[PDB]
Design an enzyme around this catalytic site. Structure first.
Site, PDB file in Angstrom:
ATOM      1  CB  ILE A  12      78.874 104.339  12.975  1.00 54.91           C
ATOM      2  N   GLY A  13      77.047 102.343  14.560  1.00 61.53           N
ATOM      3  CA  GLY A  13      76.030 101.268  14.708  1.00 61.53           C
ATOM      4  C   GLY A  13      76.471 100.043  15.519  1.00 61.53           C
ATOM      5  CB  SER A  14      81.572  96.675   5.242  1.00 57.58           C
ATOM      6  CB  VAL A  15      84.422  98.554   9.394  1.00 63.62           C
ATOM      7  CG1 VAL A  15      84.559  99.435  10.670  1.00 63.62           C
ATOM      8  CG2 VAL A  15      85.279  97.277   9.515  1.00 63.62           C
ATOM      9  CB  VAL A  16      79.543 101.519   9.323  1.00 64.65           C
ATOM     10  CG1 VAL A  16      78.975 102.901   8.941  1.00 64.65           C
ATOM     11  CG2 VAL A  16      79.050 100.469   8.398  1.00 64.65           C
ATOM     12  CE  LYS A  31      77.671  98.063   3.704  1.00 69.89           C
ATOM     13  CG  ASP A 124      68.357  92.641   7.492  1.00 67.92           C
ATOM     14  OD1 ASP A 124      67.661  91.770   8.123  1.00 67.92           O
ATOM     15  OD2 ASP A 124      69.462  93.109   7.916  1.00 67.92           O
ATOM     16  CE  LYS A 126      69.570  94.197  11.509  1.00 67.10           C
ATOM     17  CG  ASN A 129      68.992  97.984   9.198  1.00 72.38           C
ATOM     18  OD1 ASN A 129      70.136  98.103   9.677  1.00 72.38           O
ATOM     19  ND2 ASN A 129      68.627  96.952   8.472  1.00 72.38           N
ATOM     20  CG  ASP A 145      72.930  97.653   6.327  1.00 73.57           C
ATOM     21  OD1 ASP A 145      73.462  97.566   5.180  1.00 73.57           O
ATOM     22  OD2 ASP A 145      73.203  96.878   7.279  1.00 73.57           O
ATOM     23  CB  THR A 165      67.217  89.787  11.329  1.00 71.80           C
ATOM     24  OG1 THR A 165      68.358  90.510  10.864  1.00 71.80           O
ATOM     25  CG2 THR A 165      67.436  89.441  12.807  1.00 71.80           C
TER      26      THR A 165
END
Ligand SMILES: CNc1cc(Nc2cc(C3CC3)[nH]n2)nc(Nc2ccc(CC#N)cc2)n1
Length: 289
Positions: A12-13, A14-16, A31, A124, A126, A129, A145, A165
């Site tokens: 979706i969008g 560690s791996v999620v 997550k 973060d 941005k 998120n 996140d 970022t």
């Protein structure tokens, strides 16, 4: 357990990964954190994120469903929100005004206020998120996140390290100075500026040059596109994008700003086609890195 209670599907969008809870049939977002070779420092970071995500229950923050430790892996299971990124939805709309951008930032500032009341600094904020709850019209904006989030004691500021970022980094972080909650409001200023015109206040292909602009706080409101933007919106950007963090507006004060709280009478109801077209280019530029 988690390998017997859930089924995992695509990243979706560690791996999620999107998953389904078998017994109930409902969808989630997991997550997946590999914990085999984790340093002591990083175990504390992950314990902390789990703890932060449990603590924060709010209409405009993605909710933790469970936290599952297994051999080698930890899973933070969150509610699935299905409306996608905010910026990708905005480019798809027939009407887009300051009133709409005020509504978004209001929801974001409510999320940020709640983190900050709970002693959490996200660090973060941005576009990636900022998610929409669903594909329905008027779906809530939800903050995602908390991977980089930290816990602070009241208004105690400190050097917690570089995180975040580039385009959204605050001057005090770039000067390697003590920071805290105000870094989130800086990021919120940057987002608000993009929300109004569809391009960033700070940009340079060279990033050292970008960081100098940010440290200087050198943005402006160029004509023609800023000519139609209300002075009250420009006022708010100015209070958030203030270089001295002690003088910067807080989430609590920003929500009392008239452009946010008296939107129906202060914010322009005028469609901003040029914003939508810049966002399109912005979104395209970001999904190419
Ligand atoms: C349809 N478009 C989507 C949907 C979506 N669904 C989510 C994600 C979550 C929690 C963040 C785990 N709940 N529901 N996430 C994203 N983006 C995204 C953003 C951040 C992360 C990492 C985190 N946390 C993962 C995915 N884009």
């Amino acid at each position: 357990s988690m390998t017997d209670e859930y089924q995992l599907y695509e990243d979706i969008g560690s791996v999620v990964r999107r998953c389904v809870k078998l017994c109930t049939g409902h969808e989630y977002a997991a997550k997946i954190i590999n914990t085999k070779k984790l340093s002591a420092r990083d175990h504390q970071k992950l314990e902390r994120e789990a703890r932060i995500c449990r603590l924060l229950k709010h209409s405009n923050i993605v909710r933790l469903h469970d936290s599952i430790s297994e051999e080698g892996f930890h899973y933070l299971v969150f509610d699935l929100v299905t409306g996608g990124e905010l910026f990708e939805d905005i480019v798809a709309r027939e009407y887009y005004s300051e009133a709409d951008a005020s509504h978004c930032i209001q929801q974001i500032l409510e999320a940020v206020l709640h983190c900050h009341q709970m002693g959490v600094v996200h660090r973060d904020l941005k576009p990636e998120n900022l998610l929409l709850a669903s594909k329905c019209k008027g779906a809530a904006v939800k903050l995602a996140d908390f991977g980089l989030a930290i816990e602070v004691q009241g208004d105690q500021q400190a050097w917690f390290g570089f995180a975040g970022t580039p385009g959204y980094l605050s001057p005090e972080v770039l000067r390697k100075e003590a920071y805290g909650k105000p870094v989130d409001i800086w990021a919120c200023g940057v987002i608000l500026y993009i929300l109004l015109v569809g391009y960033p206040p700070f940009w340079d292909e060279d990033q050292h040059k970008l960081y100098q602009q940010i440290k200087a706080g050198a943005y402006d409101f160029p004509s023609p596109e800023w000519d139609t933007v209300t002075p009250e919106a420009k006022n708010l950007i100015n209070q958030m994008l203030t270089i001295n963090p002690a003088k910067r507006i807080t989430a609590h004060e920003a929500l009392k700003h008239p452009w946010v709280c008296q939107r129906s009478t202060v914010a322009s109801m005028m469609h901003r086609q040029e914003t939508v077209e810049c966002l399109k280019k912005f979104n395209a530029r970001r999904k190419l890195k």
